[PDB]
């Protein structure tokens, strides 16, 4: 609690300080982003200095062949006026902002930026080696600038921007142990195939083995040839039009057959991790400040209540690949699958890595 | 309108504070 993060405009007319870079979203109370902008009066002009907080969406357009091109279309923006104190926005600064005036005097004016819930966390989509431009996804940024008024122009030298990531973490208590049963009886034989699956726990931290206990109760004529185990990232993307996707991130195809009319019990352990998923351009990563190697995207925690942004989640799938033929031939699928949902995120660190 | 961007500004640095 003695280190602050500063960033100055290239021309030095605007230096922005911040207390932290990651601002935790407990689903109830979202940590606020608070800081001061130090206006060098030597390099001052009589043009208001504003500070704005933008939640936006960096996408690279698909038709435009050009590399490095990203478009930012914002979702939540806030405009805090801090050029004079003259307007009636008299607000009690924090103990962060209190120490900062003590350091820099009444030339560092404070902004008290407030982040609502029901707004997305910072989530980056993995770029191909094709891509060389800014990181695509959802990212928050605060920029401080100078202009005669808000509808005026903003010169890049008369402005400075810093990107912050809104994060989340594994709650204190865990959820129940996840478990599911989906059970197809088949057309020709009335005796059923009953799939039972469970996970050892509902909350895994990144890079931890998930172990999946599978219980098969085959009472069919049909012979389960293969068992397919997939850990599978679900991603809900809300924008002007809504688009979802289920990608897999750590799987294995086990050739454990189950006979006709035999019980089968085996537990399968699988860790997700980004290395074996590099190829999956567009998979959901966690937030990147500039370019670092972010892990697989943490689940996104939701309250009781077309919710905005990009909503990661996980479910481990358990498919049984079932013998065909006999009556309908190869025309009707016979498989039986089960999805166990679970939350995968980080622990609350009571948070950057060797950089260069 | 809707705005574009290029590749990767300034370097982000840190200063210290009062130990209150």
């Amino acid at each position, epitope marked *: 609690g003695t280190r602050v993060f500063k960033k100055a405009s290239p021309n030095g007319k605007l230096t922005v300080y911040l207390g932290k870079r990651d601002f935790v979203d407990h689903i109830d109370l979202v940590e606020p982003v608070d800081g001061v902008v130090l206006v060098d009066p030597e390099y001052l002009k009589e043009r208001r200095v504003y500070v704005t907080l933008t939640c936006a969406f960096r996408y690279g357009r698909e038709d435009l062949d050009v590399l490095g091109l990203t478009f930012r279309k914002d979702l939540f923006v806030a405009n805090v006026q801090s050029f004079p104190p003259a307007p009636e926005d008299k607000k009690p600064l924090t103990r962060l902002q209190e120490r900062l005036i003590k350091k820099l005097g009444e030339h560092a004016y404070p902004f008290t930026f407030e982040i609502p819930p029901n707004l997305p966390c910072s989530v980056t989509l993995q770029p191909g080696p094709e891509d060389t431009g800014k990181a695509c996804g959802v990212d928050y940024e605060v920029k401080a600038f100078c202009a005669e008024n808000l509808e005026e122009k903003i010169h890049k030298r008369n402005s400075v921007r810093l990107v912050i990531r809104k994060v989340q973490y594994a709650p204190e208590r865990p959820g129940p142990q996840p478990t599911a049963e989906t059970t197809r009886q088949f057309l020709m034989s009335d005796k059923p195939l009953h799939l039972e699956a469970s996970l050892d726990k509902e909350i895994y*931290y990144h890079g931890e*083995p998930i172990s999946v206990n599978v219980h098969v109760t085959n009472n069919t004529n049909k012979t389960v040839k293969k068992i397919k185990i997939s850990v599978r990232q679900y991603a809900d993307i809300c924008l002007f039009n809504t688009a979802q996707y289920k990608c897999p991130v750590a799987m294995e195809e086990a050739d454990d057959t189950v006979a006709p009319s035999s019980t089968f019990c085996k537990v399968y352990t699988l860790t997700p991790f980004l*290395a074996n998923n590099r190829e999956k351009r567009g998979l959901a990563l966690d937030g990147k400040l500039k370019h670092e190697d972010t892990n697989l995207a943490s689940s996104t925690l939701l309250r009781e209540g077309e919710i905005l942004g990009i909503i990661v989640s996980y479910k481990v799938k358990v498919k049984l690949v079932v013998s065909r033929g006999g009556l309908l031939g190869d025309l009707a699928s016979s498989d039986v699958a089960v999805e166990l949902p679970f939350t995968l995120m980080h622990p609350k660190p009571k948070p950057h890595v060797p950089e260069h | 309108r809707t705005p574009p961007s290029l590749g990767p500004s300034c370097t982000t640095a840190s200063s210290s504070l009062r130990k209150d």
Partner: antibody
Amino acid sequence: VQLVESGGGLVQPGGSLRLSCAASGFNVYSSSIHWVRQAPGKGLEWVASISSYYGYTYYADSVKGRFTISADTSKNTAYLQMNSLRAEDTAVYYCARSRQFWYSGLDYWGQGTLVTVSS
Amino acid sequence: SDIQMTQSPSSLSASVGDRVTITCRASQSVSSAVAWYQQKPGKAPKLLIYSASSLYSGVPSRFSGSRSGTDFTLTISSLQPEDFATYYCQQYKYVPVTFGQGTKVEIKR
């Protein structure tokens, strides 16, 4: 909750030696492994690191063309192939976890493996 | 270039119950990514403090440290028999992570 070091020993210079580091007590995927080299009458010197989760390896400049670091995450160990060994290259060699996410210093180590190289 | 970490008390001797400290400087801004390790010879190193101020778990509260720009200090308030060894400062900002040359605490008698 322990790392154990094997394979250290005495090799003729120019030669090679391959060290094993059998981890246990954590998840090789949420940890990342390092090799610290510490001469007897001298200090500490990191040589090699490997995040199986992100897949990258990093090396200390003095051992680029001669040292290889690996990880057999099935059997939850990691290996240091030390090729083309010199006289500077002798030390005790330690294995060392870190947090494979948000590096908070080398927390757990193992007692070491003695690597001797002279003619 | 590489980052040089130098512990300025090459040797030191003191007594049980002192506030003794070790200092370590870095070649350039390591931005409070510094650890501190203890090590009695033969036996392996053990970790004490990470990021210069956060004390590791299972580590006694009498330990702490301080950053003053490039200069990093290790503080120990009322030492015990357990706290007698050589002490090492590490940086881990830049990839070539480095270590101080080694501050050995003696015993005053």
